[model samples]
Target: MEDELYRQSLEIISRYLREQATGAKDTKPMGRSGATSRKALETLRRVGDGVQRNHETAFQGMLRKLDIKNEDDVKSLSRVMIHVFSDGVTNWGRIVTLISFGAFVAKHLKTINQESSIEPLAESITDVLVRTKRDWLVKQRGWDGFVEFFHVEDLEGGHHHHHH
Candidate 1:
């Protein structure tokens, strides 16, 4: 479960980075015109912001999964988590964050939309979020063609009556 969370987080991060790099190649060198250079720099700045958001997300999410009680605990957990998973640090660390965040969600899982009819609305929301992300990724990466391996289908139905 923890591995799955981290893997998901890391995959998004890795892919985003790849997209930024691929986009970067199209950008020409800073020219004499300040306007063009500024826009290019701004785009890079936005990418940095995106990366920072993911970093903070990993920290807070994993901190929750590790079950750190207070600021001190979180401080200690950060160092420990880093040392424990050095080689696979980025991948594993992000998962730890995801499970941590999952734990946070689990806390309010019951209270989620208390006035609503569905009790497991939290789970439903999570499902929607995941599928939405999957769809967005499909558009961005053009990798959905590779996803056909996971499908299961039957061409023939129960039985075709000869009603010609």
Candidate 2:
């Protein structure tokens, strides 16, 4: 069932991260298609900022509770997040949450001098998202749908309201 898929995803991500940790050079790109993955990252980055701005405190508290100290901690946290996603409704907002949470973890890794882990972490996040939501995403035109769902202009306009 879906649990089997989740377990397989966790294994794939864990193995990839471990290999990267050993200084293995990856000639292959992260996702199925490099261009599609790049576009997905771009869209996630834009929406990620808005998610952070809107729920900074909540995310902060969650991070504190998780207290991620290393790459393993991040993997475990991602497992928890994927479980949460499995229980919830699939939507752009939740997808943004997943990417933004990964961003926060990346920032934490940089501060702790584990900067090398960031790329693997990014790959893992993308893996989980695409694996779990492939059908839904295809129906919505993948990341293109995400961009339309959360237009940059609307996010920027919302930011202006907060400053004023």
Candidate 3:
């Protein structure tokens, strides 16, 4: 990639990864690590040339697989989950939704120790976005919602959870 392009991509990817990791919930450290911040930063560094090409490609691929035609899908499903979960996880359907959602985010794995940076999800894609948008998503969802939103295939049974 061109130097300028690479620099911009690096910044975007680094900030995006940092935002995603710090933005997640139930994001505890592993037995070996003290916290997730260091791991998040390292994860970005591991991208190598990925931040310029592969990373964005992977994200777009996942989005395509979700058949996410527009922004509506994310907001609508998140609304359902919020309403379904507003009552808590006692409801079996809501519980299932929350669990599957949580699982989706856990797919991202943050780097540890001296590992090169390239973190993954910590919970369900949707759940991660929920935390990231704990404030604005109340009335208006954003790109984070788009990233978090998934379909039945993204659930544990139908498909293996994945993150870019």
Candidate 4:
């Protein structure tokens, strides 16, 4: 269930990134931007794995705390992520955490038969990141810096590493 949720979340996010990269009027449909977005997706997948391994319980607790009910509640719930992103300390770590949290929310929505909210939630996440952190993201050279920021060797192994 965890892997499947991550996979679906990645797919949704990848689509959003691809569209943003290729939809630029002056850029070629497929080229450096496209490849970079793909690499970004791969890097995000790794970060997401780390998030799930480390914070899945806390995320569950967050969902329970939020007590999301309907689509309107789902829409309002996006504000939490926006607030987190807007909070002064902007970095890839925070970005990954927000995305991972958003993915968990997406999984919850699906389980509750509110699958219709998934796309909009993903969009909200993307919007918050791009709208607020585009300059910082570019400074980090996109996900390449994300990869450099968090080096998780043997992330799938049994060795225990705790990141708070």
Candidate that would win on lDDT: 4
Q: TM-score each candidate.
A: 0.20, 0.63, 0.22, 0.66
Better of 1 and 4 by TM-score: 4
Residue-by-residue lDDT tens digits, candidate 2, 34-153:
454545555565566677788878878877877666678767876866875876554567877776666666666666677777666766676677667867766766555665566642
Model 1, range 91-147, lDDT digits (tens) per residue? 312323333333233333223332221112222222333433444333432122112
Lowest lDDT sum, 10 consecutive residues, model 3, at 114-123
Q: Whose TM-score is greatest here?
A: 4
Model 2 alpha-carbon miss at residue 33, Å = 7.1
Candidate 2 at residue 50, lDDT? 74
| C-alpha RMSD of candidate 4 | 10.4
After superposing candidate 3 on the true structure, give the runs of residues whose Cα lies further than 4 Å from its correct spot: 1-67, 89-164
In model 1, pairs of residues that clash are 6-95, 61-97, 62-96, 62-97, 65-100
Tell me the deviation in Å of residue 48 in model 4: 0.8
The lDDT of each candidate is 0.34, 0.59, 0.34, 0.60
Candidate 4, 1-164: lDDT as tens digits:
23332343345464433332333222223223555555556666666768867998877876887755666776687678788766665456788887777767766666666666766677667666666776766675545555555653224432233456
Candidate 3 C-alpha lDDT tens digits along 1-164? 23332233233333444444344433333322223333423333333223334344554454345432334444444544455456622222233333233222222323222112222221222343345334543342221222223221123332233455
Residue 25 of model 4: what lDDT?
20
Could you tell which candidate, 3 or 4, scores higher by TM-score? Answer: 4
